[PDB]
Amino acid sequence: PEMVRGQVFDVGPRYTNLSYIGEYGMVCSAYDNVNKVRVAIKKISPFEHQTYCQRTLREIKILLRFRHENIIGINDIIRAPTIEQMKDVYIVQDLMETDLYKLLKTQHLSNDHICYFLYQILRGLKYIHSANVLHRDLKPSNLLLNTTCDLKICDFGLARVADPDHDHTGFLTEYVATRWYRAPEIMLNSKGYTKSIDIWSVGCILAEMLSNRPIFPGKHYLDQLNHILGILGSPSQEDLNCIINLKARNYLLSLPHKNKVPWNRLFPNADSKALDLLDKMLTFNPHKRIEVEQALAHPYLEQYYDPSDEPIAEAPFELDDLPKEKLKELIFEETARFQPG
Numbered sequence: 072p073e074m075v076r077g078q079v080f081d082v083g084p085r086y087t088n089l090s091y092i093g094e095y096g097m098v099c100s101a102y103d104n105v106n107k108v109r110v111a112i113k114k115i116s117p118f119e120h121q122t123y124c125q126r127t128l129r130e131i132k133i134l135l136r137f138r139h140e141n142i143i144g145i146n147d148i149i150r151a152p153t154i155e156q157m158k159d160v161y162i163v164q165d166l167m168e169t170d171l172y173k174l175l176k177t178q179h180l181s182n183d184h185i186c187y188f189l190y191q192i193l194r195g196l197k198y199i200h201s202a203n204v205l206h207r208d209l210k211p212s213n214l215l216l217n218t219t220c221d222l223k224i225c226d227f228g229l230a231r232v233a234d235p236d237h238d239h240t241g242f243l244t245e246y247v248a249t250r251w252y253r254a255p256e257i258m259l260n261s262k263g264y265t266k267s268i269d270i271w272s273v274g275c276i277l278a279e280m281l282s283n284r285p286i287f288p289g290k291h292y293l294d295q296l297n298h299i300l301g302i303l304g305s306p307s308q309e310d311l312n313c314i315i316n317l318k319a320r321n322y323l324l325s326l327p328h329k330n331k332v333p334w335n336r337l338f339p340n341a342d343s344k345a346l347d348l349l350d351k352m353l354t355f356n357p358h359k360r361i362e363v364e365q366a367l368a369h370p371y372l373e374q375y376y377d378p379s380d381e382p383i384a385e386a387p388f389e390l391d392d393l394p395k396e397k398l399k400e401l402i403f404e405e406t407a408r409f410q411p412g
């Protein structure tokens with residue numbers, strides 16, 4: 072029973088020589104005695120709260136069905152042999168040296184790195200969206216990188232099956248995903264049940280790669296929309312006409328006119344092709360926002376674009392009203408395939 076930073080981390084005989092990383096549950100690096108490579112292991116203890124169970128399950132379900140170079144896999148799942156003895160679940164994944172959040176705090180990214188990082192994000196996202204899945208929490212800390220800059224999308228805890236026919240909601244509807252990467256429609260009339268929600272987050276990531284600073288660092292729920300409008304400018308009549316919800320539309324109408332800040336003023340050193348694609352991802356109207364495959368076909372990514380080498384899921388992919396007890400059993404059953412039995 073190996074101990075790490077005053078906590079039980081018993082990953083069995085297979086995984087040894089542990090080192091702490093970060094933090095519900097803990098994450099450590101370890102040596103895999105079967106494959107002889109160092110791996111990353113995430114201990115999760117979610118059985119108290121059903122939300123933590125719901126996030127654990129949907130991620131396990133999605134990552135076991137997914138197989139893509141730019142998406143984190145689940146190599147192994149370590150847990151007790153019985154439901155009764157199962158207090159923790161250890162998810163074994165790809166070990167990655169850094170993440171884009173860490174890189175952006177101290178490293179100037181060359182245009183070539185920005186181009187390559189964006190390509191891999193969108194290549195991974197093409198696969199996710201082809202499975203009818205939305206990631207819903209794309210941000211630099213959810214983009215892992217190795218020493219050769221291979222990028223992998225991680226954390227599918229907030230991921231959902233796309234549901235565009237049930238995307239509408241009222242004004243100022245509470246939302247869970249990281250504030251700075253929230254599309255403007257979340258604060259106005261959207262539940263984040265469409266693919267266009269992830270494209271917005273990738274647009275934010277691209278802008279952040281260009282200046283090493285989040286483009287819309289909102290300090291609270293409605294401040295997030297004010298940051299977006301301060302750069303995009305006031306929505307056009309057309310874009311306002313698409314917002315039928317009276318409270319959302321009238322909030323936008325109450326605001327003084329704001330002019331669009333040109334992308335090349337905000338980003339004076341950026342490549343013009345990168346700013347043209349940025350513009351199409353950071354489009355106010357989600358219906359006019361570029362889609363992942365169009366983004367991959369954009370001239371900025373021409374050196375990498377190869378749709379034959381951009382795989383899609385072999386098949387498309389209720390947990391809302393479900394107790395933490397039933398979810399414990401579902402986590403136990405989904406992790407059965409990894410047991411030595």
Ligand SMILES: NCc1ccc(-c2cn[nH]c2-c2c[nH]c(C(=O)NCc3ccc4c(c3)CCO4)c2)cc1C(F)(F)F
Binds near residue numbers: 167
């Ligand atoms: N210090 C931040 C950080 C940085 C890199 C990594 C890392 C390195 N190689 N692989 C990973 C990695 C593997 N899986 C994940 C991973 O699943 N990260 C997201 C996540 C979601 C829920 C949750 C936790 C994390 C911990 C408790 O509850 C990241 C992990 C983390 C960590 F600790 F946040 F998970």
